[PDB]
Amino acid sequence: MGKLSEQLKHCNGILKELLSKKHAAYAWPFYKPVDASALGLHDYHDIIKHPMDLSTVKRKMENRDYRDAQEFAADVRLMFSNCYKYNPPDHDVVAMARKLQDVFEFRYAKMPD
Ligand SMILES: Cc1cc(-c2nc(Cl)cn2Cc2ccccc2)cn(C)c1=O
């Protein structure tokens, strides 16, 4: 009912959309933590100090970790920023990040007041 609750509902809706089949073609690299060892990315954790992914965001939302929309958005944007920091800008995963961030930013902007 309250403002914080209402804004977190909007955030949860966005999260559900980002994890939905509608966006799966470009969202899937963000579903789980980057497994650096599995992907042969042995410099990943030297470059990315604070990894983030949608499963972690989901766990935090479920645990009521996020106190407001701003805190939620910071994690989603951290996830994208990590991608832009680590990967050359012409790489496929970056194109996918850009597309998912477009989904995120446009819906996040429709936050209720
Ligand atoms: C460096 C990096 C790898 C992945 C990743 N996760 C899976 Cl599972 C496969 N990959 C590699 C990939 C290669 C080509 C296209 C998409 C992902 C995801 N993110 C966000 C990254 O920053």
Q: Is the CB of 83 under 6 A from ligand 1?
A: yes
Start-to-end Cα distance in the chain = 12
CA Rg value for the chain: 14
Q: Which atom, in ligand 1's list, is nearest to the CA of 31?
A: 8
Tokens of 64: 């009521």
Q: Which of 47, 84, 87, 93 to mutate to test the pocket of ligand 1 (most atoms within 8 A of CB)?
A: 93
Tokens of 46: 């030297």
Q: Is the CB of 69 under 6 A from ligand 1?
A: no
Tokens of 45: 């954790």
**In 19-91, where does DSSP find H-type helix?**
24-27, 36-39, 44-47, 54-62, 69-86
For ligand 1, atom 16, which residue shows the shortest CA distance? 93
Question: Which CATH code of 1.10.580.10, 1.10.4190.10, 1.20.920.10, 1.10.238.10 fits the domain covering 1-113?
Answer: 1.20.920.10
For 71, which DSSP code?
Answer: H
- Solved with: X-ray
Distance set, CA 74 to CA 24, 63, 92 (Å): 22, 17, 23
Resolution (A): 1.6
Domain ranges of the chain: 1-113
For 113, which DSSP code?
Answer: -
